[PDB]
RNA sequence: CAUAUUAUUAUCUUAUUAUUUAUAUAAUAUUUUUUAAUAAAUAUUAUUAAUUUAUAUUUAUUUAUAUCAGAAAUA
RNA sequence: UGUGGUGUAAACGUGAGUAAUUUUAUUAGGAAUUAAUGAACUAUAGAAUAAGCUAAAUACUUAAUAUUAUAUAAAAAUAAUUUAUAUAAUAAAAAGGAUAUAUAUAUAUAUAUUUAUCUAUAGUCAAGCCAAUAAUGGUUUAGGUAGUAGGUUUA
């Protein structure tokens, strides 16, 4: 589990190091001419995948002496997928327990993120609706309930969106389902209807591609269930439904990802 | 002050008893060493005046000489005159109030008036 | 006969520096041929990183000349 | 007590060396006809573009853009110089901060008011080199000098 905490580590300080001596500690044959004239070994390009279970056991420490490097240094920034954004947002509300540090840790990074090249890291499908999925659990679970309260977080959140592009079309039913949990009035220039679009899950895919397929949609599994639960009214659409029985079909062997995360709420309530 | 050249003032005298070339000297030259040229001299002293004279309402006079078609030359390649003899050329009329700052900026009493 | 300082050299030694030959599986950048770990879409194709390769800029190595200064000798 | 800029070639003190191989003084002295040099103020003009590197930058790198030699004639202050033209290369930079507002969508941008940056021309202030004349005593120091004296090239 480590893996992730000396890789990156090391990957971190190969990125920090001034280019005028890289080349004298981490290549081979410059040792000698080094230490006479301490050596870490060498620095290879690293998996995204490799960070994704680092969440899984600090985070905000980590965040932290992460994006604090230079903004020009482009290995270290464009490395952060949205993908990662959606699965430390999960994992900081529902497990390691302190998202409102977190939220306000990438409101500021996000402010820093926007002159680096990657606003993408931002979108509707990885920030966005994990941002009101967790949002629904926040006004459920303390019953924080105000209009104008919620509103004006919605707003804010909205403000955070650095990709326009809502093309699943989630967005709306995640917008629809808070404005009819509290009852404010849902503005958001920008967004627009889509007629939602998933990916069929299939019962004869190969064990790698199963395990790929739950890797990449296991947060809109989340999402999806999320906001089937949190409102009977979301079995309208047959389309939530195929997907979410598909998904639980082949969820068959061990347990659901929804059935840890809520529980894993319990955990740190009491 | 800036540049090269500068119209400044040399301490000549004794102690106590100050007097000054109005110079045009290199900015690196000692204050007292001899200049590019002396345009004039300048006595901080003012010329004393009787207490009848007073009551008549005499100003005292401090006298300053000046070869001032030189010293508009002289203004005129570039050199940066100091902030005594700034406030000395302004009142001759040689420069206006162009020259003046923030802290040295009422009512007239007397007009700088030319004689021959 | 003894002590001291200054200068000179077909002599010896010589920091430093500047020139000067020649050597680097010597380095750092660009050029190749290749070997490595990442990426993405659907066998990859591209990136970062080492191998070999040939032009620059340096260091190490020496060849030669000059050189502070000493030594010897002479005045 | 981090990175940067500007400031210390001046002034101050001293008289060791230095008798002229570059020192001093003088001249209304010169040329090699002293450089695409400004050191730092004037007067005008024009610019102020990208990356890389450092934590960042007006710090450093890399890149972008902006007189001389030829030839044609002209003359004369002529056995050369100067002038004008046409080419060749010149071909060599930079920087932004502080305030206002005005747009739009905190983000950029557009203006301005400030103080800075760079380039070019001229002016100031200034530098380099050479000549002539002069600059103590001892010839009981009378011969000295081999780059020495001169010529021709190259660096
Ligand atoms: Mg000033
Ligand atoms: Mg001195
Ligand atoms: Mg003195
Ligand atoms: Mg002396
Ligand atoms: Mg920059
Ligand atoms: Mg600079
Ligand atoms: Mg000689």
Known sequence: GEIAKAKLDEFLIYHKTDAKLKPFI???????????????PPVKPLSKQTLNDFIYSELLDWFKEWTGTSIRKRAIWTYISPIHVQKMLTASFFKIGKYAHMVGLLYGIEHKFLKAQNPSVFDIEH???????????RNRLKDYKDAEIAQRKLQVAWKKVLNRKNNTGLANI?????????????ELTGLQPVDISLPDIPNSSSGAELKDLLSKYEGIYLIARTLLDIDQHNAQYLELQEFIRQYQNALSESSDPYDTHLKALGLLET | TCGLVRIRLARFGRKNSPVYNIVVANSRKARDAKPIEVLGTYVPVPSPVTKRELKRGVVPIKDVKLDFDRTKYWIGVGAQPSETV???????????????????????????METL
């Open chain 1, 174 to 186: 995640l917008v629809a389902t808070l404005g009819r949990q509290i009852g404010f009035t849902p």
């Open chain 2, 86 to 112: 700034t406030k000395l050329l302004r009142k001759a009329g040689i420069l206006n109030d162009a020259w003046a700052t923030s802290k040295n900026s009422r009512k007239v009493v007397f007009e700088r």
């Open chain 1, 26 to 40: 981490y290549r081979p044959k410059n040792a000698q001419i080094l230490l006479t004239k301490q050596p870490r």
């Open chain 1, 127 to 137: 920030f966005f609706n994990t941002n009101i999925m967790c949002a629904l659990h």
